[PDB]
Design an enzyme around this catalytic site. Sequence first.
Site, mmCIF file in Angstrom:
data_model
loop_
_atom_site.group_PDB
_atom_site.id
_atom_site.type_symbol
_atom_site.label_atom_id
_atom_site.label_comp_id
_atom_site.label_asym_id
_atom_site.label_seq_id
_atom_site.Cartn_x
_atom_site.Cartn_y
_atom_site.Cartn_z
ATOM 1 N N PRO A 23 0.836 -1.215 0.000
ATOM 2 C CA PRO A 23 0.000 0.000 0.000
ATOM 3 C C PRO A 23 0.865 1.258 0.000
ATOM 4 C CG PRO A 23 0.051 -0.988 2.204
ATOM 5 C CD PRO A 23 0.695 -1.983 1.263
ATOM 6 N N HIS A 174 -5.570 -1.145 8.078
ATOM 7 C CA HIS A 174 -4.307 -0.497 8.401
ATOM 8 C C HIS A 174 -4.214 -0.367 9.923
ATOM 9 C CE1 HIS A 174 -0.762 1.764 8.314
ATOM 10 N NE2 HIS A 174 -0.986 2.537 7.269
ATOM 11 N N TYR A 179 -0.892 5.211 13.144
ATOM 12 C CA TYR A 179 -2.223 5.770 12.936
ATOM 13 C C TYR A 179 -3.155 5.264 14.039
ATOM 14 C CZ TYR A 179 0.000 7.391 8.732
ATOM 15 O OH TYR A 179 0.870 8.032 7.860
ATOM 16 N N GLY A 318 7.056 -2.015 -2.167
ATOM 17 C CA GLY A 318 6.514 -0.679 -2.273
ATOM 18 C C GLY A 318 7.257 0.164 -3.289
HETATM 19 C C1 LIG Z 1 5.624 6.856 -0.722
HETATM 20 C C2 LIG Z 1 5.122 5.840 0.232
HETATM 21 C C3 LIG Z 1 3.768 5.785 0.532
HETATM 22 C C4 LIG Z 1 3.340 4.830 1.436
HETATM 23 N N1 LIG Z 1 1.997 4.721 1.795
HETATM 24 C C5 LIG Z 1 1.581 3.722 2.634
HETATM 25 C C6 LIG Z 1 0.233 3.573 2.951
HETATM 26 O O1 LIG Z 1 -0.618 4.308 2.442
HETATM 27 N N2 LIG Z 1 -0.123 2.562 3.794
HETATM 28 C C7 LIG Z 1 0.810 1.713 4.359
HETATM 29 O O2 LIG Z 1 0.451 0.815 5.105
HETATM 30 N N3 LIG Z 1 2.143 1.863 4.048
HETATM 31 C C8 LIG Z 1 2.512 2.852 3.184
HETATM 32 N N4 LIG Z 1 3.841 2.979 2.875
HETATM 33 C C9 LIG Z 1 4.813 1.970 3.440
HETATM 34 C C10 LIG Z 1 4.989 0.891 2.351
HETATM 35 O O3 LIG Z 1 3.811 0.123 2.183
HETATM 36 C C11 LIG Z 1 6.155 -0.084 2.609
HETATM 37 O O4 LIG Z 1 5.988 -0.732 3.852
HETATM 38 C C12 LIG Z 1 7.481 0.684 2.576
HETATM 39 O O5 LIG Z 1 7.560 1.501 1.437
HETATM 40 C C13 LIG Z 1 8.721 -0.209 2.640
HETATM 41 O O6 LIG Z 1 8.675 -1.226 1.665
HETATM 42 P P1 LIG Z 1 9.645 -1.095 0.371
HETATM 43 O O7 LIG Z 1 11.085 -1.211 0.832
HETATM 44 O O8 LIG Z 1 9.284 -2.261 -0.544
HETATM 45 O O9 LIG Z 1 9.440 0.248 -0.280
HETATM 46 C C14 LIG Z 1 4.255 3.929 1.987
HETATM 47 C C15 LIG Z 1 5.606 4.017 1.675
HETATM 48 C C16 LIG Z 1 6.040 4.965 0.786
HETATM 49 C C17 LIG Z 1 7.514 5.057 0.440
#
Ligand SMILES: Cc1cc2nc3c(=O)[nH]c(=O)nc-3n(C[C@H](O)[C@H](O)[C@H](O)COP(=O)(O)O)c2cc1C
Length: 379
Positions: A23, A174, A179, A318
């Site tokens: 997400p 979530h 949050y 992500g």
């Molecule tokens: C730009 C951005 C937006 C994100 N928005 C959410 C979100 O809306 N909900 C959530 O649970 N995590 C959110 N995350 C956390 C990501 O889901 C994920 O856990 C995090 O980016 C690390 O994983 P990665 O190394 O694959 O990027 C967000 C992360 C980033 C960088």
Amino acid sequence: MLKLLEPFDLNGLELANRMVMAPLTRNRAGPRFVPTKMNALYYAQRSGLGLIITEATQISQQGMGYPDTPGIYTDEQVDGWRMVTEAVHRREGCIFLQLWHVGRVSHSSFQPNGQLPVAPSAIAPEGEVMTYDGIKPFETPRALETEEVAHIVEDYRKAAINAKRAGFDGIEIHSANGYLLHEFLEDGTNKRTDRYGGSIENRARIVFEVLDAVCKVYPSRRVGIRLSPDTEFMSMSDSDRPALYSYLVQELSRRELAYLHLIEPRIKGNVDVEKESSLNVEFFRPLYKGVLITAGGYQKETGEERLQKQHADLVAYGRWVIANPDLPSRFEQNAPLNPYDRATFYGGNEKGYTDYPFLDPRDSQEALKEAEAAERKWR
Ligand SMILES: Cc1cc2nc3c(=O)[nH]c(=O)nc-3n(C[C@H](O)[C@H](O)[C@H](O)COP(=O)(O)O)c2cc1C
């Protein structure tokens, strides 16, 4: 021969592979927090991930804290999401909506009638928050009344009803990253004395009350939940995270949910962080008998290792999926990965959103065709 690319059966949902779009908040909703054709294109482009978990989506204006995030509490919003689920499903994808309540991570300028953000207890998070008129210090939030929790639980139930009407395969609660629900879970943010504060089982109570309510809408095998068992993001702290999450996870396991989605402690919300911790997915595999999604900091090789060692069943990506809509095909072909550009993560338009390239241009064409067809269906 990557287990990342093996099809996976999610209790009747036939995922194309074991990779998940994590997400990701992108702050690109249309007016009144309504998804647009451009959002439909973004998700349709990423339909090759086995499972797509949408950006956090507020269940109420009270649950919002950042500009232009989409909601799921009005019919107008539902109709916008219909384009998204239609386009994803026309590309044979699978998509869960992530339900959101920012709790204290908000500002009264986002809130109905200029009200304070709500929280379990009146403790502001450290630092500052972006508002419509610029950066501002956080306010001390309002501590929720005992009789108001059932009303927030009902907002989740109504959000789940709207998610089902919008055509989502499932929903993700979530309960991470500082949050509302995460605030109730940790005794650093939860100082209540009523039946939602005190014991580990009181602080988890609101999570189970949410799960009960949304499982009156979706079958429990289409309800997931996301946790961050060890993060300092948004001023979180708790005096016994091992005992907190072991319990919570063991109780989640007997709930027959779609999955448990755990964030590795080496991520602090949206950034990498130097951090030693033993509350990672290896620790929680034992305590959870269902489908386990691991997330945070993975590459191809490290994600594959988690699957091979059976520390998890699915791996969420992500930032790489922001930049690589066809990440599974790139892994399969040992192709270079487009670099992700943090400057265009949040807000803006197609730039850094839908204009990252595919290996195969027919993939981009098909996503555009379905986004346009979806808009014509739900004009
Ligand atoms: C730009 C951005 C937006 C994100 N928005 C959410 C979100 O809306 N909900 C959530 O649970 N995590 C959110 N995350 C956390 C990501 O889901 C994920 O856990 C995090 O980016 C690390 O994983 P990665 O190394 O694959 O990027 C967000 C992360 C980033 C960088």
